GROMACS .gro file of C-alpha atoms in nm:
model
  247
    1UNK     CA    1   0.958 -12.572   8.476
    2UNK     CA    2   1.024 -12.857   8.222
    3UNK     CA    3   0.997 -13.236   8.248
    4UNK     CA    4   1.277 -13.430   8.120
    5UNK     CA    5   1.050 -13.728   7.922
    6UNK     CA    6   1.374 -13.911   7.839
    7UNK     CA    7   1.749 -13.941   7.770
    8UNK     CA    8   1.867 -14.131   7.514
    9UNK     CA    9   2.045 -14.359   7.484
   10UNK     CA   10   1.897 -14.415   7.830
   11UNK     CA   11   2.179 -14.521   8.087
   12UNK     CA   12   2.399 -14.761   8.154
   13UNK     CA   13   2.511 -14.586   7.814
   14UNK     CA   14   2.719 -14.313   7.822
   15UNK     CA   15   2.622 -14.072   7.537
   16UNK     CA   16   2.271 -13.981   7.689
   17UNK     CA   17   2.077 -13.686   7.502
   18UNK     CA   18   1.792 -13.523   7.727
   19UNK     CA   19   1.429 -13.457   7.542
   20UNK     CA   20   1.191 -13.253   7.693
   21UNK     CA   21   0.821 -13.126   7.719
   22UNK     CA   22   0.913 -12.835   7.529
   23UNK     CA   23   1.130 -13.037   7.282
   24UNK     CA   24   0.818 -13.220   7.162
   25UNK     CA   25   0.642 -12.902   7.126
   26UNK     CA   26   0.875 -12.833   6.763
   27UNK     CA   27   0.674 -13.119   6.662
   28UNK     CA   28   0.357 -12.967   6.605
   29UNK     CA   29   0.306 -12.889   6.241
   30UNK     CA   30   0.421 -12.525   6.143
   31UNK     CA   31   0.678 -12.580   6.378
   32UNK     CA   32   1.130 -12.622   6.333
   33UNK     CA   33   1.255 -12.891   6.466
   34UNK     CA   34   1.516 -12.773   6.724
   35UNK     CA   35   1.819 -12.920   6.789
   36UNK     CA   36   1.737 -13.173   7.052
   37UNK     CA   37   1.499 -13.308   6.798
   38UNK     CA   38   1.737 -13.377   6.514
   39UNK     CA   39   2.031 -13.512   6.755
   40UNK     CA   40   1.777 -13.721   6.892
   41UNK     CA   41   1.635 -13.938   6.584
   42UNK     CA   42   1.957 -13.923   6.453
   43UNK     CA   43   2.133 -14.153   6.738
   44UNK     CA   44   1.749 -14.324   6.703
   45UNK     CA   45   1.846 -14.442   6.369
   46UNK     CA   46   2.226 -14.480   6.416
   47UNK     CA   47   2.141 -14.719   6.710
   48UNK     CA   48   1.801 -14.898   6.592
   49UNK     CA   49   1.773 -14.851   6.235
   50UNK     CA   50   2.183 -14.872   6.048
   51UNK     CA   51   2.283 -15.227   5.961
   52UNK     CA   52   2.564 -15.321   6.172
   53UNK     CA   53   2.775 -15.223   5.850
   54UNK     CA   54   2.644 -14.881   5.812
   55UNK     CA   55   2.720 -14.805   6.187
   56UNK     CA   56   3.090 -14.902   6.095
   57UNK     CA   57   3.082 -14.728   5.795
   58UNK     CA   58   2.943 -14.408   5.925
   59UNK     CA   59   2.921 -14.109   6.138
   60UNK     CA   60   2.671 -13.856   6.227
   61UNK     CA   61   2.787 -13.548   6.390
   62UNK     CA   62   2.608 -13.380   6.594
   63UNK     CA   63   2.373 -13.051   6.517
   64UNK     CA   64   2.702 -12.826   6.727
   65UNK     CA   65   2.909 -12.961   6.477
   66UNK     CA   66   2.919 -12.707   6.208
   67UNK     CA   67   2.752 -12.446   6.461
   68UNK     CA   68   3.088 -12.458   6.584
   69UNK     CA   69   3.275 -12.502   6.339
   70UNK     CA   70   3.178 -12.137   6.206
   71UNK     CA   71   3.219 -11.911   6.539
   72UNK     CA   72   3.393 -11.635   6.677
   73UNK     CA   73   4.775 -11.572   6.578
   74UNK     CA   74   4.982 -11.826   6.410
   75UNK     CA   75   4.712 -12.027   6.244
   76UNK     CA   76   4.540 -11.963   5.896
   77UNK     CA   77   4.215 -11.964   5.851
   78UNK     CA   78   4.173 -12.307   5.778
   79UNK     CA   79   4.326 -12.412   6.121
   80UNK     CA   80   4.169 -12.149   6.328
   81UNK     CA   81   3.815 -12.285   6.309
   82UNK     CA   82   3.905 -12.644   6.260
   83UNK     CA   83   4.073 -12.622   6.642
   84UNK     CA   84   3.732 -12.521   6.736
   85UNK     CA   85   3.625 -12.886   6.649
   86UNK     CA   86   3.887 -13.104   6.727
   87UNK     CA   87   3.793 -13.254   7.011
   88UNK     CA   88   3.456 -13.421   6.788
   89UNK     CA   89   3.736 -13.650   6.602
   90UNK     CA   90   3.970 -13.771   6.909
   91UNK     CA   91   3.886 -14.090   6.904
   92UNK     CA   92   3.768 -14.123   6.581
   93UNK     CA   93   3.925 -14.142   6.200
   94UNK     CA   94   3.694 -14.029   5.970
   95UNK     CA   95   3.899 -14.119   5.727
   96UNK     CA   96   3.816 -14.488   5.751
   97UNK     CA   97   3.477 -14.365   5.654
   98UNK     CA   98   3.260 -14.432   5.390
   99UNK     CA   99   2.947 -14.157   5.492
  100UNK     CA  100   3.012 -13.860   5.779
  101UNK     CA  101   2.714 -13.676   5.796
  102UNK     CA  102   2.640 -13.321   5.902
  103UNK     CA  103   2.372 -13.158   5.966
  104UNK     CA  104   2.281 -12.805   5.934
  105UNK     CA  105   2.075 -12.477   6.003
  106UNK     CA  106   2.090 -12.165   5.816
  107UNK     CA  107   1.855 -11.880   5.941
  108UNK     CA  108   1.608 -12.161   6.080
  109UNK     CA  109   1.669 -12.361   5.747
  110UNK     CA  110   1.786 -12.752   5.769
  111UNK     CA  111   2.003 -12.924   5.535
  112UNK     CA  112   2.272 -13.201   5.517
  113UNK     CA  113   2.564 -13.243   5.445
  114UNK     CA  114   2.688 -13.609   5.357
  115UNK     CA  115   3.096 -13.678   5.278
  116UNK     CA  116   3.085 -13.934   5.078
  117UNK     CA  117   3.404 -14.179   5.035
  118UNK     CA  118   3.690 -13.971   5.143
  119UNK     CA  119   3.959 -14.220   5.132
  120UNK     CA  120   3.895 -14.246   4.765
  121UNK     CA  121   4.184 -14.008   4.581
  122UNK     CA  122   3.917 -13.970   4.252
  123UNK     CA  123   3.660 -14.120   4.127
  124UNK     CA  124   3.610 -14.478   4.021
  125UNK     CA  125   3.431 -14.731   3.775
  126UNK     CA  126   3.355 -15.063   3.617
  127UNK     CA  127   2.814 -15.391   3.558
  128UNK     CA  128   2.839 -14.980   3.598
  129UNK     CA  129   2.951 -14.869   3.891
  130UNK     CA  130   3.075 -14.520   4.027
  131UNK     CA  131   3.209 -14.393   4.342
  132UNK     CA  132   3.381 -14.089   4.404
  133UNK     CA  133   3.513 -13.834   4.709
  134UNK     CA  134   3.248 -13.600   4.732
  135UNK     CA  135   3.042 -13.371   4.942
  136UNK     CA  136   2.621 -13.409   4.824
  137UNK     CA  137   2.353 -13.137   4.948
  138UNK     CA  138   2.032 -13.291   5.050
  139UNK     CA  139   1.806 -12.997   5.080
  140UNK     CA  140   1.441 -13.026   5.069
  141UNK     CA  141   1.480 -12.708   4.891
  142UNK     CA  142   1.766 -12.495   4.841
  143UNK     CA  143   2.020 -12.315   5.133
  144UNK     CA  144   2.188 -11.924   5.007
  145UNK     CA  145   2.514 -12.049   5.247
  146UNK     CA  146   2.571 -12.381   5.110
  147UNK     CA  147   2.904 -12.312   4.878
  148UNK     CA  148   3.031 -12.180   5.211
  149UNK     CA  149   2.874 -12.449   5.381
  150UNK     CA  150   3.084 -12.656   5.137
  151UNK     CA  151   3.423 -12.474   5.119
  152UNK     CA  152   3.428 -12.508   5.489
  153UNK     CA  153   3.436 -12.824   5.474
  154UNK     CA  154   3.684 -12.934   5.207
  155UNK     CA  155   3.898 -12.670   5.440
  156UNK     CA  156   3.749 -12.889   5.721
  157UNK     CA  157   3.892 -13.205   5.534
  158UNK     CA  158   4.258 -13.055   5.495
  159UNK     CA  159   4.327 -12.989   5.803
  160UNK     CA  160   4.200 -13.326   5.953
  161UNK     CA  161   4.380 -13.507   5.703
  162UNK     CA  162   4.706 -13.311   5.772
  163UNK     CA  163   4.636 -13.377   6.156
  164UNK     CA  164   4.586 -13.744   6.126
  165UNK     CA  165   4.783 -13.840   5.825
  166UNK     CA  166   5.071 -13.591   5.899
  167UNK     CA  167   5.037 -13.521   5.502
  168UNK     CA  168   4.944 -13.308   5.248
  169UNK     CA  169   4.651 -13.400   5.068
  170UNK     CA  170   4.424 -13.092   4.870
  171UNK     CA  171   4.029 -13.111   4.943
  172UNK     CA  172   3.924 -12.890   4.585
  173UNK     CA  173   3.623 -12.815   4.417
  174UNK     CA  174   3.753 -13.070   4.163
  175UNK     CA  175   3.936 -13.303   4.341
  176UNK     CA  176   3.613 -13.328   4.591
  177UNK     CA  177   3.299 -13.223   4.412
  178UNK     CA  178   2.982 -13.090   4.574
  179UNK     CA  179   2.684 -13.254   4.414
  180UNK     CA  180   2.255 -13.167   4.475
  181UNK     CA  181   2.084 -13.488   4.377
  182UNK     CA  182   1.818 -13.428   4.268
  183UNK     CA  183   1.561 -13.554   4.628
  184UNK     CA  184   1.216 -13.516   4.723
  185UNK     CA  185   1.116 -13.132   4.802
  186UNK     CA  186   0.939 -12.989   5.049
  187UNK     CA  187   0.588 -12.936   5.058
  188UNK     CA  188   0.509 -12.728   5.410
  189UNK     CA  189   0.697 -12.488   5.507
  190UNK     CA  190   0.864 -12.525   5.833
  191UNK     CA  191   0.890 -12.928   5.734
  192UNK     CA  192   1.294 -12.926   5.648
  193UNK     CA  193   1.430 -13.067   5.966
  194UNK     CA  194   1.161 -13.339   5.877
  195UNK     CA  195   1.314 -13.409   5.543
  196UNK     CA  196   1.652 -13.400   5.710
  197UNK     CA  197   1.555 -13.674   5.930
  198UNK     CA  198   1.363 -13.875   5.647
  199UNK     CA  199   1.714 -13.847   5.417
  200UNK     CA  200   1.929 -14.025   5.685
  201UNK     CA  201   1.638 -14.247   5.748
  202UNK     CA  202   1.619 -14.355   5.369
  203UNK     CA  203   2.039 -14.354   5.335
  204UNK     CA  204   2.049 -14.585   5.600
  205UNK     CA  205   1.754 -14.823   5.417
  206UNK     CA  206   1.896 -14.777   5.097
  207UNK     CA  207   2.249 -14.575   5.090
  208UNK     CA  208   2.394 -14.415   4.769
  209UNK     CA  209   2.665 -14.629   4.644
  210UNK     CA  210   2.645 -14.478   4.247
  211UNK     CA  211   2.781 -14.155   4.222
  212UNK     CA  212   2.669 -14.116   3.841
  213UNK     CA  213   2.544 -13.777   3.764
  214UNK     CA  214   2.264 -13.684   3.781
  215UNK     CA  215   2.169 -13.869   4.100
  216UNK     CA  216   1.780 -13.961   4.054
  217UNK     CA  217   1.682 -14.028   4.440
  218UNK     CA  218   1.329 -13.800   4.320
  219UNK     CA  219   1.070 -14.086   4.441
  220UNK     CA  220   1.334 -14.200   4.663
  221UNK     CA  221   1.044 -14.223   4.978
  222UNK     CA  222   0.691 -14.247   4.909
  223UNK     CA  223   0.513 -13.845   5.022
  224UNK     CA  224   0.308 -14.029   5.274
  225UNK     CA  225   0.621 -14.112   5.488
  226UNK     CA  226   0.700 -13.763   5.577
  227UNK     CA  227   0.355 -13.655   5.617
  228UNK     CA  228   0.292 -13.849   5.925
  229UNK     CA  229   0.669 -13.831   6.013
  230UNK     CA  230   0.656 -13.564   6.280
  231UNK     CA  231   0.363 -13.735   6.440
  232UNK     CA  232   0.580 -14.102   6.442
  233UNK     CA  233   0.844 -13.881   6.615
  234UNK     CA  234   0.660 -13.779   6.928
  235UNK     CA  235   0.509 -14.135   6.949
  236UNK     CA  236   0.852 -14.283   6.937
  237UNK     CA  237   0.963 -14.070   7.234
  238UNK     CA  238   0.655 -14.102   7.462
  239UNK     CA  239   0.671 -14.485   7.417
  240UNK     CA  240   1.035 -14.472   7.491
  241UNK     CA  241   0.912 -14.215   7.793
  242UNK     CA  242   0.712 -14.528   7.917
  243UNK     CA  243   0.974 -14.792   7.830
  244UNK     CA  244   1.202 -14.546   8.077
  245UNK     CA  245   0.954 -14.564   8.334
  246UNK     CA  246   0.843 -14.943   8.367
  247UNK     CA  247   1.245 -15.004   8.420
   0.00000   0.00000   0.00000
């Protein structure tokens, strides 16, 4: 037996996410944050935290996103896994996007996965400025799958393109670099879904709009943020499991 504490966004809306007894139980220190968890903060932030810009700007798929994606006649490779997704993009050009993030867990390990400007053919520059299409790697340490993690989705990218833009356009380890800046690390183990959630949180505060390498984001939050982060968490979704109640 498990008691739903509350579904957000809570009804009317439509796109309700359920979170659980059990679900606040990852939030003990020592403990990975499950799915539910990272979904959850993440359509927190998206809905009470992104400027009205950033919303637009932005999307943030879902933890089954890239579980998905990587799963299992006619179709190569590319197009075999990428029909396994479709359906997230239907009513949605991600082209017209500045940030699509994705997150993701390798054996237990969180990590994310921001496309960065990928309307932009290469990159750009002027007062320096410089913006580029690109892939970055926020890891609060570092993932063994994440050039896979990567290829996938510049393969990801070409398909979508060629779906929605009925064109050929070539997503490349050159034409779309992968880039680590350089972000605050972990310090307890178990703490990278934290870091995850702390990332979007500070992207959305203060997004990335120089692309210059090396990006320097290494004091980017102050340490005491994520330390009482997980505890924040489950007092953001018992006050919401009140809020839910009184109404």
């Amino acid at each position: 037996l498990v008691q739903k504490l509350i579904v957000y966004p809570p009804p009317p809306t439509k796109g309700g996410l359920g979170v659980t007894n059990e679900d606040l139980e990852c939030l003990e220190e020592g403990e990975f944050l499950n799915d539910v968890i990272i979904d959850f903060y993440l359509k927190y932030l998206i809905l009470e935290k992104a400027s009205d810009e950033l919303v637009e700007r932005s999307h943030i798929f879902s933890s089954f996103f890239y579980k998905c994606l990587t799963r299992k006649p006619n179709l190569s490779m590319a197009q075999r896994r990428h029909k396994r997704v479709r359906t997230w993009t239907r009513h949605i050009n991600i082209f017209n996007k500045d940030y699509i993030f994705v997150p993701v867990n390798e054996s237990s390990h969180w990590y994310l996965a921001v496309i960065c400007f990928p309307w932009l053919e290469e990159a750009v520059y002027e007062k320096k400025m410089c913006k580029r299409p690109c892939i970055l790697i926020l890891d609060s340490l570092k993932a063994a799958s994440v050039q896979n993690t990567v290829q996938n989705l510049r393969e990801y990218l070409e398909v979508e393109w060629e779906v929605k833009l009925k064109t050929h356009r070539q997503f490349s380890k050159t034409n779309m670099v992968d880039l680590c800046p350089k972000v605050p690390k972990q310090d307890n183990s178990s703490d990278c879904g934290v870091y995850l959630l702390q990332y979007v949180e500070s992207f959305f505060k203060d997004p990335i709009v120089n692309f210059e390498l090396p990006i320097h984001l290494e004091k980017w939050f102050p340490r005491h943020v994520i330390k009482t982060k997980r505890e924040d968490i489950r007092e953001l979704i018992l006050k919401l499991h009140l809020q839910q109640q009184k109404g």
